[PDB]
Design an enzyme around this catalytic site. Structure first.
Site, PDB file in Angstrom:
ATOM      1  N   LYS A  74      -4.437 -10.504  -6.792  1.00 22.64           N
ATOM      2  CA  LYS A  74      -5.285  -9.752  -5.870  1.00 22.64           C
ATOM      3  C   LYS A  74      -6.339  -8.974  -6.656  1.00 22.64           C
ATOM      4  O   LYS A  74      -5.991  -8.244  -7.592  1.00 22.64           O
ATOM      5  CB  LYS A  74      -4.443  -8.800  -5.019  1.00 22.64           C
ATOM      6  CG  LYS A  74      -5.231  -8.179  -3.857  1.00 22.64           C
ATOM      7  CD  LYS A  74      -4.345  -7.340  -2.967  1.00 22.64           C
ATOM      8  CE  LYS A  74      -5.124  -6.799  -1.765  1.00 22.64           C
ATOM      9  NZ  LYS A  74      -4.284  -5.849  -0.959  1.00 22.64           N
ATOM     10  N   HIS A  78      -3.081  -2.738   8.560  1.00 23.04           N
ATOM     11  CA  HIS A  78      -4.178  -3.185   7.718  1.00 23.04           C
ATOM     12  C   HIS A  78      -4.816  -1.956   7.100  1.00 23.04           C
ATOM     13  O   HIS A  78      -4.985  -0.929   7.769  1.00 23.04           O
ATOM     14  CB  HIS A  78      -5.201  -4.003   8.523  1.00 23.04           C
ATOM     15  CG  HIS A  78      -6.355  -4.515   7.718  1.00 23.04           C
ATOM     16  ND1 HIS A  78      -6.265  -5.635   6.919  1.00 23.04           N
ATOM     17  CD2 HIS A  78      -7.629  -4.072   7.603  1.00 23.04           C
ATOM     18  CE1 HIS A  78      -7.431  -5.854   6.338  1.00 23.04           C
ATOM     19  NE2 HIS A  78      -8.276  -4.919   6.735  1.00 23.04           N
ATOM     20  N   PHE A  79      -5.115  -2.046   5.809  1.00 22.08           N
ATOM     21  CA  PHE A  79      -5.809  -0.979   5.112  1.00 22.08           C
ATOM     22  C   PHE A  79      -7.292  -1.309   5.235  1.00 22.08           C
ATOM     23  O   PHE A  79      -7.732  -2.375   4.785  1.00 22.08           O
ATOM     24  CB  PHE A  79      -5.345  -0.927   3.655  1.00 22.08           C
ATOM     25  CG  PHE A  79      -5.619   0.375   2.963  1.00 22.08           C
ATOM     26  CD1 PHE A  79      -4.790   1.464   3.162  1.00 22.08           C
ATOM     27  CD2 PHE A  79      -6.692   0.505   2.101  1.00 22.08           C
ATOM     28  CE1 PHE A  79      -5.020   2.658   2.516  1.00 22.08           C
ATOM     29  CE2 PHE A  79      -6.939   1.705   1.456  1.00 22.08           C
ATOM     30  CZ  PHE A  79      -6.100   2.784   1.666  1.00 22.08           C
ATOM     31  N   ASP A  80      -8.066  -0.370   5.764  1.00 23.53           N
ATOM     32  CA  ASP A  80      -9.459  -0.631   6.127  1.00 23.53           C
ATOM     33  C   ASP A  80     -10.444   0.075   5.203  1.00 23.53           C
ATOM     34  O   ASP A  80     -10.045   0.754   4.258  1.00 23.53           O
ATOM     35  CB  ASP A  80      -9.690  -0.190   7.581  1.00 23.53           C
ATOM     36  CG  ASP A  80     -10.845  -0.913   8.252  1.00 23.53           C
ATOM     37  OD1 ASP A  80     -10.673  -2.089   8.635  1.00 23.53           O
ATOM     38  OD2 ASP A  80     -11.917  -0.298   8.427  1.00 23.53           O
ATOM     39  N   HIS A  83       0.769  -1.240   0.000  1.00 24.57           N
ATOM     40  CA  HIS A  83       0.000   0.000   0.000  1.00 24.57           C
ATOM     41  C   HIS A  83       0.801   1.291   0.000  1.00 24.57           C
ATOM     42  O   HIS A  83       0.190   2.354  -0.166  1.00 24.57           O
ATOM     43  CB  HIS A  83      -0.930   0.047   1.215  1.00 24.57           C
ATOM     44  CG  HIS A  83      -1.898  -1.086   1.265  1.00 24.57           C
ATOM     45  ND1 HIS A  83      -2.821  -1.318   0.267  1.00 24.57           N
ATOM     46  CD2 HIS A  83      -2.088  -2.059   2.189  1.00 24.57           C
ATOM     47  CE1 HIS A  83      -3.549  -2.375   0.580  1.00 24.57           C
ATOM     48  NE2 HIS A  83      -3.125  -2.846   1.739  1.00 24.57           N
TER      49      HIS A  83
END
Length: 125
Positions: free
Chosen positions: A45, A123-125, A16
């Site tokens: 992905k 973590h990308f939320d 990211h």
């Protein structure tokens, strides 16, 4: 699936963080950029977001607006300012290693979960 050789923090950065990079990209940016992630994955992905700000700006989100995580679990934070992002979307029919992606620039607040020592996004939320 996170490759075991990477911590959550390392894998977040690989997936990211394109640190201190141009917000504007070519339409082939995502196809080229996603190879580094998908080489560790079993299948391409389907969607992924890259942030272009300097790394320390992304790490600072861990000290900005506290919000509830989507899963209800952990410590999540919303960025004070809109970030410069690129959204990558897998094209129909792609099968590793033939993963091609649509590239879409954007500018929006991001939400990340933070954890650890140092206290960084995991973590990308």
């Amino acid at each position: 699936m996170r490759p075991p050789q990477f911590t959550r923090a390392q894998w977040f950065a690989i997936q990211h963080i394109d640190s201190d990079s141009s917000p504007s990209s070519s339409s082939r940016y995502c196809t080229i950029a996603m190879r580094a992630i998908n080489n560790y994955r079993w299948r391409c992905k389907p969607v992924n977001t890259f942030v272009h700000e300097p790394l320390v700006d992304v790490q600072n989100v861990c000290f900005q607006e506290k919000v509830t995580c989507k899963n209800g679990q952990g410590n999540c934070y919303r960025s004070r300012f809109r970030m410069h992002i690129t959204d990558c979307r897998l094209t129909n029919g792609s099968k590793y290693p033939n993963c091609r992606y649509r590239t879409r620039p954007g500018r929006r607040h991001i939400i990340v979960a933070c954890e650890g020592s140092p206290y960084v996004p995991v973590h990308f939320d």
